[PDB]
Amino acid sequence: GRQGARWGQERRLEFIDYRLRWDGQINRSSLTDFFGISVPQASLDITEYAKLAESNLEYDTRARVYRATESFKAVFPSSAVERYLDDLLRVAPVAAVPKLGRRLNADIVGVILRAIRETGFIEVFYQSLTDPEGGERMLSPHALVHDGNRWHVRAYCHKRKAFRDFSLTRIKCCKYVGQDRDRADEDYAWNTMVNVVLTPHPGLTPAQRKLIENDFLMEGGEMHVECRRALLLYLLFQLNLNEADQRPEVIQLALKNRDEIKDLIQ
Amino acid sequence: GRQGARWGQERRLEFIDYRLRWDGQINRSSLTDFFGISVPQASLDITEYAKLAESNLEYDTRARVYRATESFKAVFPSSAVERYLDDLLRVAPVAAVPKLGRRLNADIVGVILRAIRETGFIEVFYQSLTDPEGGERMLSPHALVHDGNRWHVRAYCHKRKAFRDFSLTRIKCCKYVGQDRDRADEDYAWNTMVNVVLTPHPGLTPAQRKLIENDFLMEGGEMHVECRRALLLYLLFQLNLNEADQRPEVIQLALKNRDEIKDLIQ
C-alpha cells in the first residue's frame, strides 16, 4: 500500500539520481516512459528528489530537461554503479533467459566480506573441474571481484605462497578462522596498472571499421583502458581471446539432443 | 545522515527478504558478516523487518536462525530476481573488471517499455556489424529480454513480416510513433515451450562427471530446463555452442599488442 508506494517512488528517485550522474540530465517523459506513471506523478517525483538535494539539478526551460548542476553529488550510492540501470529495469514487459549457472551463496559471500574487512584468515573447501577431488585451502583474501556475471575472490594462498583468484561457485565451504596481517601491498599484479590498447579487428571492411571506431569513441583508430595485471585475463575473455579453467562450469555440459534442439532455432 | 541510514537499512531489509525467499532462513551473523554492522544493529534490522510482515519469519531457538514461515510472501519486488544479491553486493572490498561494452541508453529503453506497455509502433535506426550502413525499421515490440549482461527486444518487424530480436546497443534511435494491435499471440516461437535436456559433457572423467552432476542437482545424469523456442539460441551461448551476429560488438576488437599483454598474464 503506502509502503509499496514509497518503495516504488524511491526507485524512481534512484533513476533520477542515476540519470543525472551518468547522462547529465533527465526528461519528465523519461520517468513516464520508463515507469508508466502519470505526468503529475513524475512532477511529484522530481519535486521529491529536489527535497533531498535542492541544488543537484536545475530545469532548463528551452530544452525542457532537468540538468545536473555544477555542484551535483549523487544522493544514492547505487548511482555509482553503471549497471544499476539494468537492475532498475529488472525490478520495475521484461523477460529473462534461463540461467544455467549455480546461485551465489550469501553465507560464503558474507564470510569472505568479513575476512576482507578484518584482514582475516579463511579456511575453504575449493572444488573445481580441473581437480575434481578438491581440497581444503587456507586463504587471506583482500578483494571480491565482479566479472560481469561471475564473481571471484582475490586471496593469498598460504601453502602455495602466492596471490590467486578463486571462483565463488567453486567454494563449497568457507569458515573464518583467524586474524591476519594486511598483505594487499604485496600483491603486485593486483596493484600494477596496465594500459591496454584496443583497435578494430584487422580484416573488417572499411564500413564496419568506421562503425566500430564510432561506437567505441576511438581516436585515431585506438581505444585505451586501464586494467590491473591480475585482471587482464578477465578482460581478454570479453574479446574471446582465451578458452580456460576460470570460465563457468556450465560450459562443461552438453545437449542430450543436439540435433533436435538445433532444428528449433530460427 | 538519517536519510543515508534509512537508505542503508532498507537494503538490509531487502537482504533479509531476499534470504527468506531464496534460502528459507537468515542468521543474525549473516547481516553482521555481509554489511559489517554490530550485533545490536542486526537485531534492530530484524525487528524492523518484522514490523513490515509480522508472520513472514519465525525464530528457531535450537538452530538460532530466523526461518520463512508457511505464509511467507516477499515484502519487496526485488526479492523476486535471483541476481538481486549480486546487486546488493555491488552497492553495499568489491572491485570490477573493466566493461568494454557500450552503456545501456535509458531513453531508448524507456521508449521501448512504453511501446510494449501500450502495444505501440516504434521507428528505430538499427545498425549492426553484419550490415554496417544500418537502416530505419518499423517495429511492434512485446518483450524486453535480459541475457545475462546483454539486452534485446523481441519485436514484430513489419517490412519483413516476422518476429525478431534486436540488440539494445545496436538501436541508435528509437521513437514512439503510433498505436498498434496486440500481436503477442502470433509469436509462436516466443510462446512455444521447449524442454531442454542437458547431460555432463561426454569425455569427462568419472570424478568430474560425478562432480558436475552433484553441482547441478541432476537425477540419473540429466537436467531439465524449460526454454521458449525464441530463446534457445541464447541458452546455447552459455554452453558456448554457437559463435554469431547476436554476440557483443566487443568481440570484434583486437589487441594492438597481443604479444606484450600475453606476457603480463599470470
Author numbering:
A (entry chain A), B (entry chain A): 16 to 107, 123 to 273, 276 to 298
Paper text:
Here, we identify a novel transcription factor, CapW, that is associated with hundreds of distinct CBASS systems. We show that CapW is a transcriptional repressor that binds the promoter region of its cognate CBASS operon to inhibit expression of CBASS genes. Two structures of CapW from different bacteria reveal a dimeric assembly that likely binds a small-molecule ligand to control DNA binding and transcriptional repression. Our two structures suggest that ligand binding to the protein's WYL domain causes a conformational change in the WYL and WCX domains that triggers a large-scale rotation of the wHTH domains to release the protein from DNA.
